[PDB]
Scaffold this active site. Sequence first.
Site, PDB file in Angstrom:
ATOM      1  N   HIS A  10     -49.968 -23.551  76.243  1.00  0.00           N
ATOM      2  CA  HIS A  10     -50.867 -24.456  75.649  1.00  0.00           C
ATOM      3  C   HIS A  10     -52.248 -23.746  76.254  1.00  0.00           C
ATOM      4  CE1 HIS A  10     -48.479 -27.389  74.204  1.00  0.00           C
ATOM      5  NE2 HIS A  10     -48.186 -27.880  75.382  1.00  0.00           N
TER       6      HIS A  10
ATOM      7  N   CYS B 160     -53.295 -22.525  71.959  1.00  0.00           N
ATOM      8  CA  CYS B 160     -54.520 -23.380  71.296  1.00  0.00           C
ATOM      9  C   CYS B 160     -55.899 -22.589  72.038  1.00  0.00           C
ATOM     10  CB  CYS B 160     -54.441 -24.739  71.424  1.00  0.00           C
ATOM     11  SG  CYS B 160     -52.711 -25.198  71.664  1.00  0.00           S
TER      12      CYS B 160
END
Lengths: 232, 239
Positions: free
Chosen positions: A88, A130
């Site tokens: 992430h 991300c």
Amino acid sequence: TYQYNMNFEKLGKCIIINNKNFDKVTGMGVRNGTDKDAEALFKCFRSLGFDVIVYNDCSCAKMQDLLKKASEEDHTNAACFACILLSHGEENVIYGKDGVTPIKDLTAHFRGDRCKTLLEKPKLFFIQACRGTELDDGIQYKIPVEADFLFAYSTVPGYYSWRSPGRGSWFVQALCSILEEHGKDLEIMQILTRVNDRVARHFESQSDDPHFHEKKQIPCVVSMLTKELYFS
Amino acid sequence: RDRVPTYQYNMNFEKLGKCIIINNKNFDKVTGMGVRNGTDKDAEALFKCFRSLGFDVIVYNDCSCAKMQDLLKKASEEDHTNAACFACILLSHGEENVIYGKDGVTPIKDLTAHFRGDRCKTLLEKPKLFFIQACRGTELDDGIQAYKIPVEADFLFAYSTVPGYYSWRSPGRGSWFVQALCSILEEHGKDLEIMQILTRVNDRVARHFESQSDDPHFHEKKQIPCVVSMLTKELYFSQ
């Protein structure tokens, strides 16, 4: 002359950091499909000739240490170094299971002044994660210490990075097929540029939400390289 | 090197494209910014190179922030249908993510946004190149001894320096990046791919140049430029 020298006993070390499951405190979901990504990556980079090791669900301290060690290893018989982060992410930062850590903090261990054995040799970082909330709605003597790095991000600064829980991340599938086919005969920028093309074209998101439907992605290469780089 | 069909940016257009050069030398007192001696030299070299490549080059001088935005937005609104690509080159004072006009500071991302997909439809699927000679911070490299398209695609930013670092400039010879750039562009501009060129500029700026100042804070410093590519094809300026 215009190529990095590849005449070394080993191609180099490849640390793949595969972060799937996160602490409930960070409140971040399981990254499904990331295991597809890692195994595919493991094949490619191995097949290229890298000495790849895969570390699962690392903590920030763990990541920092992984890198710092490798940084302090002896790279005299290595052509280059490659690290790959699957996690992430937010801007300038990547996630351990126990929080975030700045990407620059992971890379700077390999600065010229902090890893003499890797001076004048490419240090490659591939970052699938991300990079912000944005959506692409689509349309129609001495050498510098910061040199010889190349970061290939999965996406541009501020934008979301797409991953199918079934097929893996868009970026990774692309990078793998191109490498599985031209890793040996193309220059690194040629390779990444085709990856840029395949992610830009071949992919388009699909959900039942109108906010996330038919969305787009473009990866982003940063290069401070000083030679062409071929893996052979 | 081998030129492989569906992998080049299509260059068969009536014209190569616009190359807008913004030469900021002079800044209002209040910005505390100094006169960028060397920049006229840099601008001369560049305009000749890009002309020679075949760009229709335009040089603007000592721009306000509003002007910088205005001319770029309007540039973004012209009909580029008959051009193969677009180029913009910024020569100014800068800091992390911003660049100066004479009256102040404006975000680089805001200048470049004008030429996105949704915002500049006539440059869609075509390379939009940006060259930036400006400081990006204050840090110094001390050195070491030896269908559908994303709106953000087909952009290449070639910065003279890495994020957070200084950018060097001879009052006499002009900035290192520019010197290096123009040199390589002279020789191989018509025979090398864009990334091949910029990499060579990376090598040259990294080796051929080392600072020299009476100030030991500034003495014997080094520099590495930084290329960011969202291009989807190889880009050659010829054929």
